[PDB]
Design an enzyme around this catalytic site. Structure first.
Site, short mmCIF file in Angstrom:
data_model
loop_
_atom_site.label_atom_id
_atom_site.label_comp_id
_atom_site.label_asym_id
_atom_site.label_seq_id
_atom_site.Cartn_x
_atom_site.Cartn_y
_atom_site.Cartn_z
CE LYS A 353 38.93 58.05 -91.60
NZ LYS A 353 39.35 57.01 -90.62
NE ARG A 361 40.22 55.09 -85.54
CZ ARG A 361 41.14 55.55 -86.39
NH1 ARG A 361 42.24 54.84 -86.65
NH2 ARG A 361 40.96 56.74 -86.96
CG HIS A 422 39.37 60.09 -87.73
ND1 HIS A 422 40.47 60.80 -87.41
CD2 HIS A 422 39.75 59.22 -88.73
CE1 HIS A 422 41.51 60.39 -88.15
NE2 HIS A 422 41.07 59.41 -88.96
N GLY A 428 42.24 56.90 -93.48
CA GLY A 428 42.50 58.09 -94.31
C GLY A 428 43.86 58.02 -94.98
CG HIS A 429 47.64 57.60 -92.75
ND1 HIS A 429 46.87 58.11 -91.77
CD2 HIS A 429 48.91 58.17 -92.61
CE1 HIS A 429 47.61 58.96 -91.04
NE2 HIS A 429 48.85 59.00 -91.55
NE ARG A 508 47.11 55.77 -89.45
CZ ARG A 508 47.25 56.68 -88.50
NH1 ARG A 508 48.45 57.18 -88.20
NH2 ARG A 508 46.18 57.13 -87.84
CG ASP A 518 40.21 49.59 -90.63
OD1 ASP A 518 39.35 48.70 -90.82
OD2 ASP A 518 40.48 49.99 -89.46
O1 VO4 Z 1 41.91 56.92 -90.91
V1 VO4 Z 1 43.63 57.12 -90.13
O2 VO4 Z 1 43.55 56.44 -88.37
O3 VO4 Z 1 44.94 56.10 -91.05
O4 VO4 Z 1 44.17 58.96 -90.21
#
Ligand code: VO4
Ligand code: VO4
Lengths: 595, 594, 50
Positions: A353, A361, A422, A428-429, A508, A518
């Site tokens: 990231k 985003r 971030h 991250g999920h 997400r 992503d």
């Molecule tokens: O990288 V996440 O916006 O799915 O926590």
């Protein structure tokens, strides 16, 4: 034990730190011999890990080539009225990431005068990992470029998802606006790869393909994993999975004022949840699932269900044992602890990231799209800039939602805070779930993966009750194997496991915080982190020894998200497809030939 | 750049296994300079672990000295009508454990002709750990001997537990039956150590001490942990901790024929649960929790609850940060993943169970005690063999529970199957929970551990509703710091944290499957497992590095179960009580000075 | 080579300093084994000389 001998014997404190090179342990290995083997093995892993060599983590070029960092993450930083970043401010954020120092990072400007939103862990990828693959040593694919064709297509998927949030998955086959979404999306020539699911003729079936992946089993039966729909039992508490989900008909950041306040780090609109809890039945519920979860919550539910059903009792060496069952190795404790550790605490996602990609985003992209159509000179593709079908639908929703201001083309968000602070790439999920589930698939094995999920259900449209799921003609439901090895038409565990990662990662996207890439390549990165852990651990397990007898040594044979078959052996050798390989797995596109 | 340069440019495939000694990452370390430091740290951890040296895991002596293996584990193997193990079947079991070989173990005899209960993972302690402390390299104390004065005091605590299963914790101060137990237990001179709770005078107060531990806060306020009574939120689903617990007034293996069938590994009497779910409010409920849980279930509930309240948002370095929060390190993701990993997959407990101690279960001793008073010769202490107050109560229970048969002194079990098919010492539950909560206390810190748990509650006696908890004289509720930083009287997070491990550990005793020792010492085994992992990880964390600026480097400062303060620093240095030590933690009774 | 796989393939600059542990050379030794043997032999010479 003579009179004198007895009279001479002495004792001393038995302490935790006392050392005994001789002891009466019932163990074919001596005390020092056990320590040495553990020692050699640890060295071997560290050497083996280093031998992989550094990953080709390469920035896509956007940061050097796009004017004023419009392709970069800078949420919570200072912006102008068009949401363009104060360049000094971004320069200070780079110093932060570069330095991996908490005090430097605290000097990064905020976009509001006080109580501005915090950077989520810009130091997070910089840690020296004790085991598994190090923070910077799992590959992920380069993200598509800001100006790319395929990024426009992905942004279009996310707008469509936003437009369809409240429509129950049950009615995708018959709904008019989901048909429109599909036609619109197939018009994008650049919308292939990214595990995109199409039918035999190459079209996107509304019921079975739209908003799904092509991982094995994901496009069969209902959108929602059986695991997200079943009762689970915790500490004797029997829990129905009805959730206080997001409210229908509300969107945020539907006006430049609310959007810009967020991009700067100001207080969000109040996110609202239902009063009576409901089952997951539409895109907004998947968005809710991915917003309200916490690392291994979904994976924890799924393993609890798998235990309850007693399927894991048949897995591994002890699947053939008449006299024993595993617990700490190749049994329940092992499975459940290895599952949680499988994602290396999301640290690869953090390295990618911040240190590597720093991707903007989808809500930031939508800002540029809004100001390209109306102030700014960014050459986004005609496929989105002139997509009147999508753009008319988008502005109407913003109007209804924003208090009547027309011609706003922002991405309507499903929560008031928009994305986490971030960078977008990867999710991250996606890393987390990708890993947890890989671990589950590995322990289950391919074969047990083909077993039927018993008593499949789907939610009704209001999400107040479940109904039994029964296959029909359109469903794409194949063969599975029941408790009796007796063949049926039905949903497989493997298939239902893939849907959990798919539901969370793509959730997400429904939330408005991620593109497909992503989550799709994110799940790959997680699958790799897990496999690295499994490999390291396997050789040291008792059941990994080759012994004399009916029960053979342990191995993990299963199938990746991509569909390629993997088989992991104790001695850092593995089969990938029809290829034999050695060393630590990096991904399905790579193999050091075994010899 | 130039026409020529552009034309000569070449590309190749970008694969997962491609190698790039140079890349444009925004990182003060080069790709090779990062991999090396990581390599160097792994070596160092491996060498530090080797340096601790082999643990003094020393068998009690019972297996050499007690005849026909009457102090050893052999559930599921063949026995005679008195539960004496077939000595040849027991030899084969030791061959199994020694060999660490799955196929040898498939030859341990079963005690029934067909379908017998399976051994639970005799190989499980033989794994070579990738990290943390190796499988054989965490200390636990020796278990008390079969004939010891303290073993019998412990058995007697388990019998009382059995007899008090349906009595609401709230009624312990005034209950006549609960008095009987308290008196009978203070009567054992041997009942000391094992974190036994007593008041300002050496007495066991029925309400605040009995079946508790003396870990900080455990003996204050209500028996049950706040964490086991609060609502928790999973994936948006709001859960009330009402559980289909075990049914009241219902015991198992209360006759020789049922108890023996079990020791032989046959089908258990069917365990029954309630139809309408209840909150925890008596011993039988804690037994149910401990039977119905799965590894980190309880700990998961507790960290979810702590997250919900926002207490972990304040902890660690980012507690001092105005511009940042942690996640993957020194935030939520780190906390929850390190919590689960802290128990080293229970494997320390497994090595100790099988390779070291091979201790019989409380239900097996009960069967000794029964055949001693009535067919056998083992010299158990008279303080249990002649404990007529306790022995009358026991045969009453059993008699009220079998067909009306007199003079059985077997331990009445809370579940049809009795104990799992693995040895008694230590408790896997205890090392698991011991580790999880240790992690939780480490990340929280001592200062935040002193904070007031908001809106404490207890169940009513029926188990159907919660009531606000209010402190009064004799609760031993002490001082806590509130959300504004002023001192209140109320339960602390640390106390409530400690109760979680106490509830589950002692839970197994209420179940009839473990003595106090298994849980209390096992908890300390889990605590060290956990600290060893925290130490190894800490040095490599970004927030562990020494920087200039107001925010200080990370460290874990908290308090052990035993009450001794610990502070873990990055350099494999740590403060234990008032001593500066170096290297890897082994226990609070040991320190290599710095 | 499915449509999805083809669309997902990526390239990067091929430079003089790029490193490849797997390459399609017609050579009985792998890249790393070739470097290793050369390495072991250089050490042998230095030892033998000393
Ligand atoms: O990288 V996440 O916006 O799915 O926590
Ligand atoms: O699984 V236990 O050692 O707490 O009976």
């Amino acid at each position: 034990q003579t009179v004198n001998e007895l009279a001479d014997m002495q004792t001393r404190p038995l302490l935790s730190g006392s050392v005994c090179r001789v002891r009466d342990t019932v163990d074919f290995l001596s005390p020092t011999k056990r320590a040495k083997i553990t020692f050699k093995r640890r060295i071997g892993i560290a050497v083996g890990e280093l031998a992989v060599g550094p990953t080709c983590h390469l920035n896509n070029g956007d940061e050097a080539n796009i004017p004023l960092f419009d392709g970069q993450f800078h949420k919570s930083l200072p912006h102008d009225d068009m949401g363009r970043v104060n360049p000094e401010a971004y320069q200070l954020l780079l110093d932060c990431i570069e330095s991996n120092d908490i005090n430097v990072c605290d000097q990064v400007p905020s976009g509001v005068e006080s109580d501005g939103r915090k950077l989520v862990n810009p130091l997070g990828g910089g840690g020296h990992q004790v085991d598994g693959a190090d923070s910077d040593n799992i590959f992920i694919k380069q993200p598509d470029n800001l100006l790319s064709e395929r990024l426009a297509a992905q942004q279009a998927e996310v707008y469509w998802m936003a437009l369809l949030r409240d429509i129950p998955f049950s009615q995708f086959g018959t709904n008019n606006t989901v048909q429109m979404a599909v036609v619109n999306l197939q018009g994008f020539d650049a919308f292939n790869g990214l595990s995109i699911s199409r039918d035999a003729d190459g079209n996107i079936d509304p019921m079975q393909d739209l908003f799904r992946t092509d991982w094995p089993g994901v496009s069969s039966g209902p959108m929602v994993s059986q695991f997200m729909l079943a009762n689970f039992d915790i500490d004797g508490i029997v829990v129905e999975p009805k959730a206080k989900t997001l409210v229908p008909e509300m969107e945020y950041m539907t006006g430049v004022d609310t959007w810009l306040n967020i991009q700067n780090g100001g207080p969000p609109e109040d996110t609202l949840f239902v009063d009576e809890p409901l089952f997951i039945r539409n895109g907004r519920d998947l968005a809710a699932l991915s917003f309200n979860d916490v690392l291994y919550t979904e994976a924890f539910r799924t393993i609890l269900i798998m235990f309850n059903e007693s399927i894991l009792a048949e897995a591994g060496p002890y699947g053939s044992s008449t006299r024993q069952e595993g617990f700490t190795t190749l049994g329940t404790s092992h499975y459940i602890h290895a599952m949680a550790a499988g994602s290396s605490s999301t640290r690869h996602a953090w390295y990618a990231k911040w240190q590597v990609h720093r991707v903007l985003r989808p809500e930031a992209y939508g800002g540029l799209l809004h100001f390209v159509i109306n102030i700014d000179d960014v050459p986004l593709p005609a496929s989105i800039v002139s997509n009147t079908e999508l753009l008319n639908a988008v502005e109407s929703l913003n109007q209804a939602q924003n208090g009547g201001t027309n011609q706003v083309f922002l991405l309507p968000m499903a929560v008031g805070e928009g994305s986490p602070v971030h960078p977008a790439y990867p999710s991250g999920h996606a890393i987390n779930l990708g890993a947890y589930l890989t671990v589950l698939k590995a322990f289950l094995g391919f074969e047990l993966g083909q077993r039927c999920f018993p008593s499949p259900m789907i939610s009704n449209d209001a999400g107040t009750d479940r109904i039994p799921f029964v296959p029909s003609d359109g469903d794409r439901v194949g063969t599975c194997i029941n408790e009796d090895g007796e063949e049926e038409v039905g949903l497989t565990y493997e298939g239902e496991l893939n849907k959990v990662t798919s539901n969370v990662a793509i959730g997400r996207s429904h939330l408005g915080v991620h593109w497909r890439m992503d989550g799709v390549f994110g799940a790959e990165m997680g699958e790799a982190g897990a496999i690295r852990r499994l490999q390291q651990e396997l050789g040291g397990l008792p059941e990994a020894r080759d012994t004399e007898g009916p029960i053979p040594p342990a191995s993990y044979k299963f199938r990746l998200y991509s569909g390629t078959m993997i088989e992991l052996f104790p001695d850092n050798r593995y089969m990938l497809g029809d290829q034999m390989c050695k060393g630590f797995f990096t991904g399905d596109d790579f193999c050091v030939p075994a010899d």
